[PDB]
Design a protein around this motif. Structure first.
Motif, PDB file in Angstrom:
ATOM      1  N   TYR A  93      -3.663   3.541  -0.758  1.00 33.22           N
ATOM      2  CA  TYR A  93      -4.078   2.888  -2.033  1.00 33.22           C
ATOM      3  C   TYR A  93      -3.141   1.738  -2.354  1.00 33.22           C
ATOM      4  O   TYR A  93      -1.922   1.794  -2.042  1.00 33.22           O
ATOM      5  N   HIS A 147       6.298   7.021   2.261  1.00 34.60           N
ATOM      6  CA  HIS A 147       4.855   6.856   1.925  1.00 34.60           C
ATOM      7  C   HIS A 147       4.484   5.382   1.692  1.00 34.60           C
ATOM      8  O   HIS A 147       3.273   5.077   1.656  1.00 34.60           O
ATOM      9  N   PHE A 170       0.888  -1.177   0.000  1.00 32.88           N
ATOM     10  CA  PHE A 170       0.000   0.000   0.000  1.00 32.88           C
ATOM     11  C   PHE A 170       0.920   1.220   0.000  1.00 32.88           C
ATOM     12  O   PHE A 170       2.072   1.135   0.436  1.00 32.88           O
ATOM     13  N   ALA A 171       0.394   2.351  -0.442  1.00 30.40           N
ATOM     14  CA  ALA A 171       1.095   3.611  -0.282  1.00 30.40           C
ATOM     15  C   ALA A 171       0.120   4.766  -0.094  1.00 30.40           C
ATOM     16  O   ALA A 171      -1.009   4.726  -0.621  1.00 30.40           O
ATOM     17  N   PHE A 172       0.542   5.765   0.680  1.00 26.49           N
ATOM     18  CA  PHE A 172      -0.094   7.096   0.753  1.00 26.49           C
ATOM     19  C   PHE A 172       0.177   7.792  -0.582  1.00 26.49           C
ATOM     20  O   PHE A 172       1.284   7.720  -1.118  1.00 26.49           O
ATOM     21  N   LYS A 173      -0.846   8.416  -1.156  1.00 26.60           N
ATOM     22  CA  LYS A 173      -0.697   8.926  -2.508  1.00 26.60           C
ATOM     23  C   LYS A 173      -0.652  10.440  -2.362  1.00 26.60           C
ATOM     24  O   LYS A 173      -1.677  11.049  -2.096  1.00 26.60           O
ATOM     25  N   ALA A 174       0.551  11.019  -2.486  1.00 25.66           N
ATOM     26  CA  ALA A 174       0.745  12.459  -2.423  1.00 25.66           C
ATOM     27  C   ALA A 174       1.975  12.822  -3.251  1.00 25.66           C
ATOM     28  O   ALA A 174       3.100  12.555  -2.819  1.00 25.66           O
ATOM     29  N   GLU A 234      -5.198   8.713   3.425  1.00 18.17           N
ATOM     30  CA  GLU A 234      -5.780   7.694   2.520  1.00 18.17           C
ATOM     31  C   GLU A 234      -4.657   6.792   1.987  1.00 18.17           C
ATOM     32  O   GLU A 234      -3.653   7.334   1.506  1.00 18.17           O
ATOM     33  N   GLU A 275       6.574   8.904  -5.216  1.00 23.65           N
ATOM     34  CA  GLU A 275       6.221   8.937  -3.777  1.00 23.65           C
ATOM     35  C   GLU A 275       7.504   8.826  -2.969  1.00 23.65           C
ATOM     36  O   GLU A 275       8.321   7.954  -3.243  1.00 23.65           O
TER      37      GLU A 275
END
Ligand code: NA
Lengths: 5, 57
Positions: free
Chosen positions: B5, B42, A1-5, B3, B38
């Motif tokens: 993903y 992250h 999973f990753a934080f998307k920013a 959030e 990223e």
């Protein structure tokens, strides 16, 4: 999973 | 809250100005046009996919 920013 | 993903692949790696490693993330259920850089910090439980990228490059 990753934080998307 | 922030959030999360699903990651399909790690497709590339770079160093930012500051010296921090960034990874180019392929997002599961999306295609390449939506890949984003990223910060390493992250990525959640992506160690196996970082291993796969490093093996391919
Ligand atoms: Na784009």
């Amino acid at each position: 999973f990753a934080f998307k920013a | 809250g922030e959030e999360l993903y699903e990651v399909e692949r790690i497709v590339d790696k770079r160093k930012n100005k500051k010296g921090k490693t960034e990874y180019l993330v392929r997002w599961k259920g999306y295609d390449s046009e939506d890949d984003t850089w990223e910060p390493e910090q992250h990525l959640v439980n992506c160690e196996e996919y970082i291993h796969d990228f490093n093996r391919r490059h």
